[PDB]
Design a protein around this ligand. Structure first.
Ligand SMILES: Nc1ncnc2c1ncn2[C@@H]1O[C@H](COP(=O)(O)OP(=O)(O)OP(=O)(O)O)[C@@H](O)[C@H]1O
Ligand SMILES: Nc1ncnc2c1ncn2[C@@H]1O[C@H](COP(=O)(O)OP(=O)(O)OP(=O)(O)O)[C@@H](O)[C@H]1O
Lengths: 361, 341, 569
């Protein structure tokens, strides 16, 4: 109540400041310039007004398509407004705060390194690459088995140095009432250019990357608009775009995006996925949880589950203590859980072996 | 005191209810109200400006389009579908034969939240939910485990793919709001039963297509995977046929636990008849041995329906005790039902 | 039983601490430090349940630090709690002797540490102590030396003449070469820029021991001052660089050297900083430098005696005798100063600690109202805040412009959980156009808000620095808000220094000078590249930094050199 007391007691100065600028309605888009003093302007009220500007605003600062404030009485220009587009879809597109630091890697070395130098090093030491340039690459492509999809990006989140970057979900591009995706894909680009080097990442491009053509009926027409408008706006020359790129999906399909990327993109890497000697690394990260007996050998257990990525062995460490709670054991003995680990790999492979290799093959 | 008699003169008497479009660091907020109108509002009172965020409803005082107070009003279409409640009288103790099946899921749903002391000290944390299924048409018997869960915490049940694909989408966004609303009600349980998204044949009304259906399901996986949300909104999936769903769905969830529903044996069926006929009154000559011997591959609701039709037929004679001749003659009706076509 | 007759019920017979919580009746506890000696077995949980019984209470078993007391009992039992085992005694003993900056604990405890003979003094005197922990700090550091400081040496002298000296103070530590650059430069005498430089003079060698206190104070008399920025800087040096001296020469040397220069001091600019060379090291110190420094009070100026006599009279000792402030109130006031009396009851209310006497001392609540702000600030030291009711009641009930003073109480009570409440409240005070509550807000968070970092802080730093306002409050807001990201941590190991280089490099493109930008770029790296000390809090043992509250009280009306006096830090 005290904060609301002082909060409501500022209305006496607020009402004195309420006289000016409260007639600033509304926001209006300009059209053309006939001369220096006089400009034609349109407003959402549907009435297009040709009017002059206030003497407190330099006329050279107003460019075609700039929204400005208006004093409805005189209709003259009051103050320009930088923000224009878009409603809540943008704020949903924005993400903030870090998580999943680099210590969460599962042993991948050359992978994580080669993708570190494409994104983090150019913005960490810009003068270095500009000096020795050449020129940094445009971006990368991620795909393959599920372990570990999409978490590698979380690494860039926690390793982001200063300015936060934006993540984007794929399926929201395609929408009912065709023609909404056109505005969608366009606006975020301008936003990014104002965002000075901020990163834009699309997940599951295979949803909007349906290629190419079928007999009838479309069908892919509303899809092809989304992807092709994407590539066309990606192939513009101004800047373009300094915001770099980041891409991830599941299967390498389809051919149209895959044939369009190597001109504009580079550095396609494939998982990898745990190597034999690398499988133990996931066990080293999960070893900090619960309590590891000094006699437990990770390398012995690791070979018994090939192609499990990190998820399944996470459930191995999980079912250890899970079945230990049911048996009241405080620590999980190596021989105790493995009897349930051969069962937890086989029983879940019985109905399905999870053949992601078959998904794209 | 005096502030209540002051600020009221500024907003009233008439005022409009608009929507927030975007906020400027100059404390001028751009509001949008019916129809297609904009403005600069700067007020230092009742805000709460940081918690508002664009895309929410704000008041408009006639002079001039000022926002005196914040309004969060629900209602809302989706918020209506989660409640209430049930808190059903049924319990997990009214079912039998799945003790070996139920032990792990009952543990898994009471693993977090209640009984946290052995969970939090062990540092396991498998909060991806559970996945259910079974034959031939069960999954409601697995729902008979959801009733016990409805007795604890918060519950929400969203079933059937018709709610997305009946019309054009906008795809998952209907599910995307279920995630966040369950986050505002966290902890809560979200149960999904019988997922036909890949098993459906004909879409409802006019919508397309088979592959767009898949893409809304895939975005459901990334929502569920997920990057990046730690909230629960515990999710449970269930269906009749797991073979239809793609293996692409299993790694994000449920990677730890999935259960299979076995067919009941003679001992189980005996238990089932016991539990249903507990409240019912039967004649002395009714025996539980011959009944389960004559039946082959029947679930709890089948032996339930035969008793319901036995009592319905006994209503024709207005008798509360069902005789064995009436019971067998009634049993022959559902027996002839499944055997007619 | 406790009403009239008998005494010593089953509570002494039975052994229940649950009823022992209820055994005691309301009485002064300063005497209750005593109990029946039981076996260390019953003494351990005895002391645990007694502790948790005593935390709410003003006095805690941690009293051995503050009190005073000072009798040999707490040193005897303090080295007897680890008696007699000298091996597993490694903790609470070695960490205690090497974690001690002052000489009193290792001194009384030195006479109370009977392990071996005469050679325990090797693990005492904080020579090998600060040496070992300083090389483990080099084990867990460290700060860049050649690149930043020499690339800055290409830039010759910055225009701030302000924050650049304390760099080489805390950084080096110990090396001589930059010490002769410090000195030989500050021989030019420019402003108070000599300050952090001569502070590195004795802080370098004194980083381990002893040190420099031979040539530390020579510039004092070497440089009539006629003010602090001239001969008072080095006069501050040996007093603050002391940190455990006494020893005992440095006491009588400081008292002597200040009794040399008196009318030129005079009562004002240096007398602010001198008691910090005494009261720090010893509270119950027999020497009274208050009287000899209080004979100079006659100048009658009400203004400079605010910030002068405030921590001038409060900084001599912690006392605890109830007599001292009565003395100095009568001989000082006489009468009264009509002004200082405020700060004098503030000094009383300072003397005792959290006795709960302060909530009874605020009933005055003058139109001056500074009684209530520091009275609630210091007046309650307790783990549970419990001060939200009154801390909010004084701002909601208080007269105008006192709410400017209000956030300053965020220093003490907030050591527990600042994250929730501080950026909450002060987040509303941050975008207020008032530079005073913006300044005292960003300080209100300040150091206690620098304990740990967050994404809200670094993300909030944006557009805090995009404001078009002039004046130092802008880059004190933003640039002080920079130092809250971490403290004495890095850079090698751990967080990269390139991002700070790019932030302070891009924000300095403005104005262009506006020399305050060349002041801010060093400002963040005071604490940023200082390192070599972990705090933590200061401190974990529940003492308090004396230079911080003192100095942060003056620039509240920040004007000219008070900010650099505070920039001693
Ligand atoms: N090699 C690994 N190292 C570290 N963590 C791993 C590894 N493999 C799997 N994981 C963990 O397993 C979890 C499950 O992976 P997830 O299901 O998110 O992949 P995905 O995003 O579904 O893949 P895709 O996007 O290709 O379908 C991830 O959070 C990840 O942290
Ligand atoms: N062992 C048991 N004890 C008690 N009741 C049982 C037992 N097994 C099954 N049941 C009951 O039998 C019912 C079986 O439901 P059934 O499978 O017929 O639903 P359904 O109509 O197939 O649902 P859906 O159409 O959504 O698949 C459950 O509601 C359950 O309560």
């Amino acid at each position: 109540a005290p904060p609301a007391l002082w909060d409501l007691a500022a209305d006496k100065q607020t009402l004195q400041s309420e006289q000016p600028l409260q007639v600033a309605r509304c926001t209006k888009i300009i059209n053309a310039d006939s001369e220096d003093p006089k400009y034609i302007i349109n407003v959402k009220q549907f009435a297009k007004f040709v009017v002059d500007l206030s003497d407190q605003v330099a006329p050279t600062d107003i460019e075609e398509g700039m929204r400005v404030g208006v004093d409805r009485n005189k209709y003259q220009i009051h103050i320009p407004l930088p923000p224009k587009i878009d409603p809540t879809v943008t704020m949903m597109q924005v993400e903030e705060k870090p998580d999943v630091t680099y210590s969460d890697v599962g042993g991948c070395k050359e992978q994580i390194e080669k993708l570190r130098e494409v994104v983090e090093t150019p913005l960490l030491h810009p003068e270095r690459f500009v000096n020795l340039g050449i020129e940094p690459p445009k971006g990368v492509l991620l795909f393959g088995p599920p372990g570990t999809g999409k978490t590698l990006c979380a690494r860039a989140v926690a390793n982001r140095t200063d300015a936060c970057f934006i993540r984007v979900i794929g399926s929201e591009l395609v929408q009912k009432y065709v023609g909404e995706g056109a505005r969608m894909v366009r606006e975020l680009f301008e936003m990014a250019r104002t965002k000075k080097a901020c990163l834009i990442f699309f997940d599951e491009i295979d949803a909007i990357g349906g290629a190419r053509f079928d007999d009838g009926a479309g069908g892919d027409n509303e899809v092809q608009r989304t992807m092709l408008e994407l590539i066309n706006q990606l192939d513009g020359f101004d800047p373009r775009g300094n915001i770099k790129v980041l891409m991830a999906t599941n299967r390498p399909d389809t051919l149209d995006p895959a044939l369009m990327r190597p001109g504009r993109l580079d550095r396609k890497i494939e998982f990898s996925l745990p190597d034999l000697e690398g499988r133990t690394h996931i066990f080293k990260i999960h070893a900090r949880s619960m309590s590891v007996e000094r006699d437990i050998r990770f390398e012995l257990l690791a070979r018994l589950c090939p192609n499990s990525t990190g998820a399944e062995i996470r459930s191995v460490c999980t079912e250890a203590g899970m079945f230990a709670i049911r048996a009241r054991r405080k620590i999980a003995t190596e021989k105790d859980f493995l009897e349930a680990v051969n069962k937890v790999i086989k029983s879940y492979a019985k109905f399905s072996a999870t053949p992601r290799y078959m998904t794209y093959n | 005191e005096e502030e209540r008699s002051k600020v009221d003169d500024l907003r009233g008497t008439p005022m409009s209810v608009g929507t927030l479009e975007e906020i400027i660091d100059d404390n001028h907020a751009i509001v949008s109200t019916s129809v297609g109108s904009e403005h600069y509002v700067s007020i230092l009172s009742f805000v709460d400006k940081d918690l508002l965020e664009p895309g929410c409803s704000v008041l408009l005082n006639h002079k001039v389009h000022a926002v005196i107070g914040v309004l969060m009003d629900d209602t809302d279409p989706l918020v209506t579908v989660m409640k209430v409640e049930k808190a059903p009288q049924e319990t997990y103790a009214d079912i039998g034969g799945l003790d070996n099946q139920i032990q792990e899921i009952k543990e898994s749903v009471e693993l977090p939240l209640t009984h946290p002391e052995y969970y939090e000290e062990m540092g396991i944390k498998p909060p991806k939910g559970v996945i259910l299924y079974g034959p031939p048409g069960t999954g409601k018997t697995l729902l008979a485990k959801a009733v016990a869960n409805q007795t604890s915490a918060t519950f929400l049940r969203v079933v059937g793919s018709e709610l997305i694909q009946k019309y054009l989408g906008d795809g998952p966004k209907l599910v995307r709001e279920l995630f966040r609303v369950a986050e505002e009600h966290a902890p809560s349980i979200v149960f999904i039963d019988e997922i036909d998204a890949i098993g459906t044949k004909r879409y409802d009304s006019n919508s397309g297509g088979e592959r767009e259906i898949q893409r809304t399901m895939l975005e459901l996986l990334n929502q569920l995977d997920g990057f990046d949300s730690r909230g629960d909104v515990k999710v449970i999936m269930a269906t009749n046929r797991i073979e239809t769903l793609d293996p692409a769905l299993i790694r994000p969830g449920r990677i730890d636990r999935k259960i299979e529903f076995p067919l009941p044996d003679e001992k189980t069926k005996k238990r089932i008849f016991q539990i249903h006929t507990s409240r019912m009154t039967l004649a002395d000559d009714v025996t539980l041995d011959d009944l389960i011997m004559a039946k082959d591959d029947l679930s709890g609701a089948d032996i339930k329906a035969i008793c319901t039709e036995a009592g319905l037929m006994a209503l024709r004679e207005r008798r509360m005790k069902v005789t064995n001749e009436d019971f067998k003659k009634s049993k022959e009706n559902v027996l002839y039902k499944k055997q007619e076509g | 039983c406790k009403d009239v007759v008998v005494q010593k019920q089953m509570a002494f017979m039975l052994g229940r601490h649950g009823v022992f919580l209820e055994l005691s009746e309301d009485v002064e506890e300063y005497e209750d430090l005593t109990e029946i000696m039981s076996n260390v077995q019953l003494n351990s949980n005895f002391l645990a349940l007694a502790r948790e019984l005593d935390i709410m209470e003003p006095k805690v078993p941690d009293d051995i630090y503050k009190t005073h007391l000072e009798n040999n009992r707490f040193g005897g039992s303090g080295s007897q709690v680890d008696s007699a085992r000298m091996n597993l005694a490694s903790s609470f003993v070695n960490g205690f002797v090497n974690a001690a900056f002052g000489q009193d604990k290792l001194l009384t405890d030195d006479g109370n540490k009977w392990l071996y003979k005469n050679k325990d003094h090797g693990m005492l005197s904080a020579a090998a102590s600060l040496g070992m922990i300083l090389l483990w700090d080099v084990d867990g550091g460290l700060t860049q030396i050649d690149k930043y400081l020499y690339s800055s040496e290409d830039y010759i002298k910055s225009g701030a003449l302000l924050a650049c000296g304390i760099v080489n103070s805390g950084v080096r530590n110990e090396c001589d070469p930059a010490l002769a650059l410090l000195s030989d430069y500050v021989l030019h005498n420019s402003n108070t820029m000599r300050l952090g430089s001569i502070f590195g003079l004795g802080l370098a060698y004194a980083g381990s021991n002893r040190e420099d206190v031979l040539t530390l104070l020579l510039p004092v008399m070497g440089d009539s001052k006629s003010s602090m920025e001239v001969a008072g800087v080095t006069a501050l040096a040996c007093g603050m660089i002391a940190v455990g001296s006494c020893n005992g020469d440095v006491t009588s040397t400081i008292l002597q050297t200040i009794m040399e220069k008196s009318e030129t001091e005079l009562k004002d600019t240096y007398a602010r900083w001198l008691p910090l060379g005494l009261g720090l090291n010893h509270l119950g110190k027999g020497e009274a430098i208050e009287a000899i420094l209080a004979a100079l009070e006659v100048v009658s100026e009400p203004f400079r005696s605010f910030a002068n006599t405030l921590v001038d009279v409060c900084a001599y000792a912690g006392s605890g005798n109830v007599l001292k402030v009565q003395q100095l109130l009568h001989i000082c006031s006489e009468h009264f100063d009509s002004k200082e009396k405020e700060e004098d009851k503030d000094k009383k209310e300072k003397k005792d600690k959290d006795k709960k006497e302060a909530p009874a001392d605020m009933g005055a609540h003058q139109g001056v109202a500074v009684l209530g702000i520091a009275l609630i600030a210091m007046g309650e030291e307790i783990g549970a805040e419990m001060a939200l009711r009154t801390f909010g009641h004084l701002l909601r009930y208080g007269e105008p412009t006192l709410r400017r003073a209000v956030p300053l109480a965020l220093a003490l009570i907030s050591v527990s959980n600042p994250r929730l409440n501080i950026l909450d409240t002060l987040s509303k005070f941050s975008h207020d156009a008032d530079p005073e509550v913006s300044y005292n807000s960003i300080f209100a968070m300040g150091m206690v808000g620098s304990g740990t970092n967050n994404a809200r802080l670094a993300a909030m730093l944006r557009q805090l620095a995009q404001y078009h306002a002039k004046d130092p409050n802008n880059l004190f807001m933003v640039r002080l808000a920079q130092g809250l990201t971490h403290l004495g941590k890095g850079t090698l190991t751990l967080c990269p220094y390139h991002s700070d280089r790019q932030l302070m490099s891009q924000v300095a493109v403005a104005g262009l000078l506006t020399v305050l930008v060349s002041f801010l770029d060093v400002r963040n790296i005071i604490l940023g590249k200082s390192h070599y000390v972990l705090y933590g809090l200061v401190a974990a043992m529940q003492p308090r930094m004396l230079v911080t509250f003192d100095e942060e009280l003056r620039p509240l009306p920040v004007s000219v050199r008070v900010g650099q006096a505070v920039d001693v830090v």
